[PDB]
Amino acid sequence: PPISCPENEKGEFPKNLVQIKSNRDKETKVFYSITGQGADKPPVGVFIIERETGWLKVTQPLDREAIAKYILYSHAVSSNGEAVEDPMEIVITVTDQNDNRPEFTQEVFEGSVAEGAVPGTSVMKVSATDADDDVNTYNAAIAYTIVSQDPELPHKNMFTVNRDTGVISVLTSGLDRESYPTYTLVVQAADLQGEGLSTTAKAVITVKD
Amino acid sequence: PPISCPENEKGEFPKNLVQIKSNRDKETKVFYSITGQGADKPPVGVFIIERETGWLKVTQPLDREAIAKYILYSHAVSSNGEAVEDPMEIVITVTDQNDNRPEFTQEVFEGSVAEGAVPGTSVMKVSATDADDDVNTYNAAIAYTIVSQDPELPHKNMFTVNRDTGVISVLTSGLDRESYPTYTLVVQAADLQGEGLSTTAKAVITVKD
Numbered sequence: 063p064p065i066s067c068p069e070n071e072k073g074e075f076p077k078n079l080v081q082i083k084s085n086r087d088k089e090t091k092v093f094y095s096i097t098g099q100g101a102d103k104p105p106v107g108v109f110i111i112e113r114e115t116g117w118l119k120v121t122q123p124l125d126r127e128a129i130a131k132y133i134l135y136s137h138a139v140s141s142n143g144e145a146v147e148d149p150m151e152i153v154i155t156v157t158d159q160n161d162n163r164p165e166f167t168q169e170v171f172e173g174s175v176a177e178g179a180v181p182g183t184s185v186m187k188v189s190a191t192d193a194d195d196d197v198n199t200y201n202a203a204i205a206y207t208i209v210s211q212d213p214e215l216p217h218k219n220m221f222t223v224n225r226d227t228g229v230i231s232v233l234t235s236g237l238d239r240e241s242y243p244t245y246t247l248v249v250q251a252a253d254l255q256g257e258g259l260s261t262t263a264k265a266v267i268t269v270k271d
Numbered sequence: 272p273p274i275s276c277p278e279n280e281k282g283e284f285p286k287n288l289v290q291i292k293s294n295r296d297k298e299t300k301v302f303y304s305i306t307g308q309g310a311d312k313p314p315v316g317v318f319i320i321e322r323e324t325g326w327l328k329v330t331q332p333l334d335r336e337a338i339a340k341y342i343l344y345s346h347a348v349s350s351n352g353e354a355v356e357d358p359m360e361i362v363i364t365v366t367d368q369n370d371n372r373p374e375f376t377q378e379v380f381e382g383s384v385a386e387g388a389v390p391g392t393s394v395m396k397v398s399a400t401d402a403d404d405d406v407n408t409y410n411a412a413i414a415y416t417i418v419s420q421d422p423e424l425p426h427k428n429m430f431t432v433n434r435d436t437g438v439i440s441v442l443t444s445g446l447d448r449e450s451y452p453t454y455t456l457v458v459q460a461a462d463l464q465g466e467g468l469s470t471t472a473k474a475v476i477t478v479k480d
């Protein structure tokens with residue numbers, strides 16, 4: 063059966079994963095080995111096996127974003143020097159932890175809007191990515207919010223962002239090019255549908271005629 | 272051996288966990304079943320098994336803080352109505368996600384300090400707990416910070432908090448009873464050693480003498 067291990071595990075190492083046994087255990091003395099990337103190939107020694115007991119072990123914390131899936135092979139050789147089984151495929155799946163903050167595609171997004179634009183007009187889009195597992199978890203489910211607006215004139219809520227799409231829209235009337243030519247918005251992207259880890263970037267909006 | 276499953280999984284359900292096989296599937300057609308709390312007993316239907324193929328599945332997102340360990344038994348009955356195998360124990364371990372914010376033991380912590388206390392004197396202790404897995408993960412490793420001090424006089428750094436202990440101390444001199452009687456500190460607790468999920472509470476300090 064497939065084997066699971068969570069990434070970023072703490073505590074004492076090594077940790078037991080599964081004990082491998084051969085049926086020819088009582089017929090003859092059996093020695094156990096593992097090969098593959100993560101065993102004898104780079105990264106070397108991530109997984110080990112006790113040669114006499116057959117206990118498969120992980121020796122360090124794992125990282126899903128480095129390697130999410132390990133394919134290894136177990137070997138069973140008797141004291142006479144013959145393989146008593148065919149090499150057996152071992153698949154080790156690395157399950158995700160929410161350990162990556164979202165990341166905006168740019169540090170400073172540029173947009174523009176006409177000062178006459180009706181409330182509810184789309185202006186610009188911001189976007190972030192999240193390196194965590196977006197297939198199985200919510201650790202990469204991003205929600206967009208606006209943290210601050212500068213200047214806060216004529217008031218502090220001139221714009222709003224669609225929490226799913228990252229589209230920034232004119233929320234209210236009051237845009238005035240002659241008084242406040244540009245706005246610096248600090249936008250936020252947070253995983254766990256807005257409840258988790260977060261990052262910030264800037265959105266600079268120029269006001270046009 | 273488990274049979275590990277992460278909590279709060281998204282996507283389509285049910286999801287394959289493992290395929291149960293009997294040897295004596297060649298002689299006779301075998302029907303597979305599972306019993307126990309989580310199968311036929313409350314909570315009913317969390318885990319199911321295909322009767323003909325023997326694929327054990329989970330039907331819903333799990334919650335480690337509700338149930339962290341399931342004990343099931345798989346049964347193998349032939350078409351003639353006789354059990355061909357003894358009931359086999361199946362342990363199901365629920366692995367942790369960081370889905371719980373740290374929570375302070377109180378909403379408002381109360382302490383006091385004499386105005387003549389030398390800088391570096393212990394004043395009080397704030398405490399937070401985290402419901403996530405503190406044995407295997409960092410999802411419950413709490414770090415304390417002071418977000419804000421009120422009032423910011425004589426300056427904004429009158430107090431400091433030990434990030435591990437939650438012990439608040441006098442950082443600087445200037446602690447006049449007469450001109451400022453009460454300090455309300457906004458304290459924060461963040462998991463993943465300060466880098467994860469967070470909530471805030473209040474610490475009210477009354478200056479004595």
Ligand SMILES: [Ca+2]
Binds near residue numbers: 125126127128161
């Ligand atoms: Ca990682």
Ligand SMILES: [Ca+2]
Binds near residue numbers: 126127158159160161
């Ligand atoms: Ca991750």
Ligand SMILES: [Ca+2]
Binds near residue numbers: 161162193
């Ligand atoms: Ca994330």
Ligand SMILES: [Ca+2]
Binds near residue numbers: 278333334335370
């Ligand atoms: Ca939970």
Ligand SMILES: [Ca+2]
Binds near residue numbers: 371404
């Ligand atoms: Ca949890």
Ligand SMILES: [Ca+2]
Binds near residue numbers: 371401402462
């Ligand atoms: Ca937590």
